[PDB]
RNA sequence: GGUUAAGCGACUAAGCGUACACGGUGGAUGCCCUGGCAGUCAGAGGCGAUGAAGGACGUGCUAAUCUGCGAUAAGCGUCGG
RNA sequence: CCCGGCGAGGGGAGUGAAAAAGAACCUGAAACCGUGUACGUACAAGCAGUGGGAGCACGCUUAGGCGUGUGACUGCGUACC
RNA sequence: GUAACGGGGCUAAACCAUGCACCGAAGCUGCGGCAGCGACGCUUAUGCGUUGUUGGGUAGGGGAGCGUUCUGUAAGCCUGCGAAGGUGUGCUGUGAGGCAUGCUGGAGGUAUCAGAAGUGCGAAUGCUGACAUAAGUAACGAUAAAGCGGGUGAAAAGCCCGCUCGCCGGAAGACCAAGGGUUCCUGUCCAACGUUAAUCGGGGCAGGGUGAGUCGACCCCUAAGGCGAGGCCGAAAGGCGU
RNA sequence: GACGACGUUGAUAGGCCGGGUGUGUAAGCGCAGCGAUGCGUUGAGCUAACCGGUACUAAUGAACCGUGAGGCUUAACCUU
């Protein structure tokens, strides 16, 4: 139920070798507005594939 | 030239912040801002403000060029902890530690 | 669950009040001890 | 120089270890004493119904606490410095 | 004066012998947690050291075949009270 | 799980007899060094020429030393041309240690020979403070339930407004005593507090709010019981009671 | 996590169209009856995950990672 010995700081680091985050590879650019956005997502101004979807 | 920005006594554990800090070490400031903008972490908001402050300091206090800036050094240090009490069952009491951290960002044109 | 402390102002003063302590020789000695120690609140009067 | 075969063989570090450099956390050490401790030589050995010891509430150009004071309320008269 | 939410927290300027004395403030040790550099480590089994010892990096040096850090491989080796 | 040579293996690398080599310990020898105890040269206020011999060690006995704080020597000596303390490096002694010096620090330190002790820490499920581990793991407190539009804002699943949905309804509605004591209303703020965010709050700060001849208390009367002038009783304190 | 299919030169998912299956004669209207009900229109209406089809909606042009002929020695071969 509980440990018999204190784990070392090296073992702690090994367990955390899979905790690193992954950054986004790249961002898409809209044809008309020309701002960066997540792929398959609308832009901040309210654009998607140069169609000007609802902004409000 | 090297410019420094700091955020001391930030309400976040050092371990959590270090996850976001490792994503922008050695990257260009323009690319670093993009990475932080699309990271769903609370520490990302804190780090982004410090990075922006460092860029402003170089532009104003040193007359540097934004396009030439780059994140050369970034590290997070543990700060003072706040002690609290959390009641448990059968009259037992436990100690709660609210951890803080210091965030340092260095931007240079080299 | 009913607990041991059930407050009641009237019973508090009649049991540990200033006049209750002054009505007996032993009670008066309690005040003398607390006066010597320097207690800011001699009794539970208020 | 080319082809094939056989034998041999560096450059990787997701992480970790040791050494050094530079930091964070933390408040040890050194230095410091308007606080304590133990005595010596002299004082005074009692206060109170002319209201005591100890308290409550008030009192300032004054919101709070401390000190002083008591509706004459951080003070009044008189004699000296 | 500048970034920021007329924030928090910082970077300049100025004061001072000193701001790495900035009010979380003299000196600022250890446990503990980080960034950078050199070397070792992903076919090898156990109190983690000790004796032997290659290679690599660096500082010297009239190359003087030395010093410092690291430690592939190998003999022996089951903490303290 | 081979498991009755340690193993590989061996027809000698097994056994018996004889002989000659070699390996093998901190044992013995060789070279350098230190110390104890003996006798010798009457050496000397003793070290040697020498000279032999000894030196594992618990309980325990004997002998000799290191360092720390304080007092005298000291109205001396060192020190802002940088003291104590902190952190490295080099040298040095048989050991506890000592000396010099770079950086940090910014005002005290102290020879020699004597004197006095709150004089040396790894352990006592020792005491106090600080910081690790498990671990970014368990958990976030009744399974009555939420969905969308607009507003405010640096930021809205949680705040405000609106339309639906769901739950209690002999309560999860309304009014009081006891108890608490400003939690009440308005403006303003978001560090800490709220088990998340927060513009919101029983949170921070400032101002405002409690109006009685008839309600309650006080007041008049007494129950259980308490106290009790004299009194009765008891070493004192004190007990009972008109 | 992984593994398989597909991304407009497209049937991957939803919707839509047809069918099947399940339930068992919808609503409205008309007729009979004082009425509850019954009968006709009618095996009607509705129908999840299934079968066969269909680009109506969503699967965007890009960007990113991964390179540029691949060590030494020896023998046999090219030039048995």
Curated annotation (Swiss-Prot), chain B:
NCBIfam families: rplV_bact. It comes from the Bacteria. L-tryptophan binds at residue 90. Belongs to the universal ribosomal protein uL22 family. One of its GO terms (molecular function) is structural constituent of ribosome. It comes from Escherichia coli (strain K12). GO terms for cellular component: cytoplasm; cytosol; cytosolic large ribosomal subunit; large ribosomal subunit. HAMAP family: Ribosomal_uL22_B. Pfam families: Ribosomal_L22 (PF00237). Part of the 50S ribosomal subunit. In TnaC-stalled ribosomes forms part of the binding pocket for L-Trp with the leader peptide and uL4. The wild-type allele (erythromycin sensitive) is dominant over the resistant allele, and is also dominant over the temperature-sensitive allele at both low and high temperatures. This protein binds specifically to 23S rRNA; its binding is stimulated by other ribosomal proteins, e.g. uL4, bL17, and bL20. It is important during the early stages of 50S assembly. It makes multiple contacts with different domains of the 23S rRNA in the assembled 50S subunit and ribosome. The globular domain of the protein is one of the proteins that surrounds the polypeptide exit tunnel on the outside of the subunit, while an extended beta-hairpin is found that penetrates into the center of the 70S ribosome where it lines the wall of the exit tunnel. Removal of most of this hairpin (residues 85-95) does not prevent its incorporation into 70S ribosomes. Two of the hairpin residues (Gly-91 and Ala-93) seem to be involved in translation elongation arrest of the SecM protein, as their replacement by larger amino acids alleviates the arrest. The keyword rRNA-binding applies. One of its GO terms (biological process) is cytosolic ribosome assembly. InterPro entries: Ribosomal_uL22, Ribosomal_uL22_bac/chlpt-type, Ribosomal_uL22_bac/org-type, Ribosomal_uL22_CS, Ribosomal_uL22_sf. Keywords: Antibiotic resistance, Ribonucleoprotein, Ribosomal protein, RNA-binding, rRNA-binding. The keyword Cell inner membrane does not apply. This is Large ribosomal subunit protein uL22.
Curated annotation (Swiss-Prot), chain C:
The keyword Disulfide bond does not apply. One of its GO terms (cellular component) is ribosome. It holds the Pfam family Ribosomal_L34. InterPro entries: Ribosomal_bL34 (IPR000271), Ribosomal_bL34_CS (IPR020939). GO terms for molecular function: structural constituent of ribosome. It comes from the Bacteria. Transmembrane segments: none annotated. One of its GO terms (biological process) is translation. PROSITE patterns: RIBOSOMAL_L34. Keywords: Ribonucleoprotein, Ribosomal protein. Belongs to the bacterial ribosomal protein bL34 family. PANTHER family: LARGE RIBOSOMAL SUBUNIT PROTEIN BL34M, MITOCHONDRIAL RIBOSOMAL PROTEIN 34 FAMILY MEMBER. This is Large ribosomal subunit protein bL34. It comes from Escherichia coli O45:K1 (strain S88 / ExPEC).
